Amino acid sequence: GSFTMRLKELGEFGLIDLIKKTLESKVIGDDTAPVEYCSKKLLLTTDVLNEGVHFLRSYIPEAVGWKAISVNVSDVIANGGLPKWALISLNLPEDLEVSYVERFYIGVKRACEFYKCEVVGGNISKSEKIGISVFLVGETERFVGRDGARLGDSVFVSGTLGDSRAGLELLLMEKEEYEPFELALIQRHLRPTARIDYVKHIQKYANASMDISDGLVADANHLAQRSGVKIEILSEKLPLSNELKMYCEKYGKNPIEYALFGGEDYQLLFTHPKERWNPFLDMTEIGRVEEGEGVFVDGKKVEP
Amino acid sequence: QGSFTMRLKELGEFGLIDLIKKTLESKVIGDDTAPVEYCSKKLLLTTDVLNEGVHFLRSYIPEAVGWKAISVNVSDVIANGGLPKWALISLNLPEDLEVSYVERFYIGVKRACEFYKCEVVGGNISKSEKIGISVFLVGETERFVGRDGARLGDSVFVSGTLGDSRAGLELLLMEKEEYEPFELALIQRHLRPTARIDYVKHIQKYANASMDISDGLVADANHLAQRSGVKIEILSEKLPLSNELKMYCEKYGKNPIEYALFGGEDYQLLFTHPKERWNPFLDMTEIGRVEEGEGVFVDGKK
Numbered sequence A: 001g002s003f004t005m006r007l008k009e010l011g012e013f014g015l016i017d018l019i020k021k022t023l024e025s026k027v028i029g030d031d032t033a034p035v036e037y038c039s040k041k042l043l044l045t046t047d048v049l050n051e052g053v054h055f056l057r058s059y060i061p062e063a064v065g066w067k068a069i070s071v072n073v074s075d076v077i078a079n080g081g082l083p084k085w086a087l088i089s090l091n092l093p094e095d096l097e098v099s100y101v102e103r104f105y106i107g108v109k110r111a112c113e114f115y116k117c118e119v120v121g122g123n124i125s126k127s128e129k130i131g132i133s134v135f136l137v138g139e140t141e142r143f144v145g146r147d148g149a150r151l152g153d154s155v156f157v158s159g160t161l162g163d164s165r166a167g168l169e170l171l172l173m174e175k176e177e178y179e180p181f182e183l184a185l186i187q188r189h190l191r192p193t194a195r196i197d198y199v200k201h202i203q204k205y206a207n208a209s210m211d212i213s214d215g216l217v218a219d220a221n222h223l224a225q226r227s228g229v230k231i232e233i234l235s236e237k238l239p240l241s242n243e244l245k246m247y248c249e250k251y252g253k254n255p256i257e258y259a260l261f262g263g264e265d266y267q268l269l270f271t272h273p274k275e276r277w278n279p280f281l282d283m284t285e286i287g288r289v290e291e292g293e294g295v296f297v298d299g300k301k302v303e304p
Numbered sequence B: 001q002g003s004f005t006m007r008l009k010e011l012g013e014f015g016l017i018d019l020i021k022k023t024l025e026s027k028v029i030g031d032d033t034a035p036v037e038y039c040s041k042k043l044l045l046t047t048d049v050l051n052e053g054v055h056f057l058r059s060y061i062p063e064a065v066g067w068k069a070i071s072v073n074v075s076d077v078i079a080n081g082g083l084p085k086w087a088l089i090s091l092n093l094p095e096d097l098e099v100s101y102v103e104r105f106y107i108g109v110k111r112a113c114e115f116y117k118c119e120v121v122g123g124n125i126s127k128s129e130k131i132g133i134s135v136f137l138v139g140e141t142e143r144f145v146g147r148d149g150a151r152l153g154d155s156v157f158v159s160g161t162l163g164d165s166r167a168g169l170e171l172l173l174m175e176k177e178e179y180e181p182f183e184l185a186l187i188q189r190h191l192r193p194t195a196r197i198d199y200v201k202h203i204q205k206y207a208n209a210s211m212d213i214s215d216g217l218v219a220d221a222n223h224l225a226q227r228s229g230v231k232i233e234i235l236s237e238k239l240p241l242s243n244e245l246k247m248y249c250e251k252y253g254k255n256p257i258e259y260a261l262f263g264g265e266d267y268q269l270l271f272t273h274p275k276e277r278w279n280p281f282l283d284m285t286e287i288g289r290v291e292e293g294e295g296v297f298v299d300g301k302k
């Protein structure tokens, strides 16, 4: 035995901080990395999907391809940008069916057409399990990160919350038959759609923005932390879908818990004066930026 | 039922890439980097991967792996006529890996970025069983140079010397406690290859076809040849050999020519153009010619 500090002890964000300092980096910290180029800003970002962690080999491949692109396009949109070019690095087992990869890219192709971006390259390496690393390049006239929230700002989110988590739980049940609303939830988990419809809004009005990937509470703390402010959320303001309620009804669950802690919805979390609100978009006011520290819900403070 | 469906192993690496290209209806895929039109210039996107047990061992000096991680990708950018700008590094890391490993990896990354004048602006972290390193690089150029432009009559050049890296890998594999200075040089060339950043202008201005030598001379020359629909004739006696490589072969009874022909990971350059565009102030060596036909030949044989 020797005892040496391991990554596990440091923790995810502790490691990122170490990386940021070692690099003496000033840009690291947001969903994307803004770089100055031709009077505009290019946004560089990357996400990963590993077999056994974010999907199973039994998952429909085209959906996995759709998701791989969507997941990263989500970061770009959350920071006020439009996707442009992407590369996909694949770690593949030599026993995998050729049709799997082909179908994965069919899903990638459809997502790219939908988001109006393009996969221009990538890499292939041999491995035990499937690993998917996506690199995306986007552009914007105004980058919006996690540290620009202003006190008095209202806190917004897009769509509904908790759907993805319920979808995953339903998939885990491995039932041989699901009801329509259950398939809807499963589809939302398996095939999320990045809110590319919010780009202009974020780019023009948000003071602080990011996408909800790990859950509202957890991601709201990063926002509150980087903006050095306090976030007060009202549970009864959380946008809930009928399918989620139906799910929580059938399995004796509490919707609010799914809305606050459910991950992988890939909706947006942004802030700005309530007056900038756009009723044409499905945004919902759920709280506000108050001078202070931490994230509070109905008064009590909740940590990630 | 029975599964008779084709598996990746059967199809092969390049056959897979062709299928991927076809599926995306992509016109750009195929070269070391991907050129995209932007701001009256050409941005170059590219990605390489270093996986534990395959491209390196966890026992290798971390900072060297960090240096190489950046260097191998910058090499692709350089080989297609561009300069590196921004990079992202996605890491698959075992939760029980020493933090010192990661910090030292990034010290190597930092040093390479300062040397090549580019910057790591972000990345990703994921839990895994083994260390996985995926680097993404963005470069920029005024003139993109791919692998399909070789014109007949062109001379075939390479930079530096060849076979050094393979010699270095073999020395590493001997797991000796101490190496002679010349052996450390060889090891240095395998562990910490220096991308040919000094060739950017030359490649950008006068190369009709270019790429870096990573798989090996003959192996990569073959790609250059089929991509250009030309045949490449190389003369072994012209291959650039280093004193330390020759010293190595002398000591271990090896043939420096084989190393220069098949040795991988030197990350030197392979490009073609008229003999008159030769620049004596760069260490390029003419090793062959571009003629009509197909395939790669060495001293007459395929």
Ligand SMILES: Nc1ncnc2c1ncn2[C@@H]1O[C@H](COP(=O)(O)OP(=O)(O)CP(=O)(O)O)[C@@H](O)[C@H]1O
Residues within 6 Å of the ligand: A088, A089, A090, A120, A121, A122, A123, A124, B017, B020, B028, B029, B030, B031, B032, B033, B034, B047, B048, B076, B212, B213, B214, B215
């Ligand atoms: N999963 C993937 N998706 C899309 N394109 C891919 C890909 N894997 C590889 N490619 C593309 O096919 C071509 C070859 O990439 P490859 O990684 O084999 O070579 P390389 O040019 O990086 C040289 P090296 O030996 O130096 O690594 C590139 O144009 C690349 O973008």
Ligand SMILES: Nc1ncnc2c1ncn2[C@@H]1O[C@H](COP(=O)(O)OP(=O)(O)CP(=O)(O)O)[C@@H](O)[C@H]1O
Residues within 6 Å of the ligand: A016, A019, A027, A028, A029, A030, A031, A032, A033, A046, A047, A075, A211, A212, A213, A214, B089, B090, B091, B121, B122, B123, B124, B125
């Ligand atoms: N190995 C690495 N090297 C450099 N930067 C890294 C890194 N791993 C993560 N980062 C950076 O730290 C910040 C966080 O990345 P992270 O991948 O955890 O979040 P994310 O913003 O992509 C949200 P999500 O939950 O949606 O995936 C980013 O600015 C990222 O570029």
Ligand SMILES: [Mg+2]
Residues within 6 Å of the ligand: A031, A074, A075, A078, A210, A211, A213
């Ligand atoms: Mg994000």
Ligand SMILES: [Mg+2]
Residues within 6 Å of the ligand: A046, A047, A048, B123, B124
């Ligand atoms: Mg990420």
Ligand SMILES: [Mg+2]
Residues within 6 Å of the ligand: A031, A046, A047, A071, A072, A075, A213
């Ligand atoms: Mg993300």
Ligand SMILES: [Mg+2]
Residues within 6 Å of the ligand: B032, B075, B076, B079, B211, B212, B214
């Ligand atoms: Mg290359």
Ligand SMILES: [Mg+2]
Residues within 6 Å of the ligand: A122, A123, B046, B047, B048, B049
């Ligand atoms: Mg590559």
Ligand SMILES: [Mg+2]
Residues within 6 Å of the ligand: B032, B047, B048, B072, B073, B076, B214
């Ligand atoms: Mg390469």
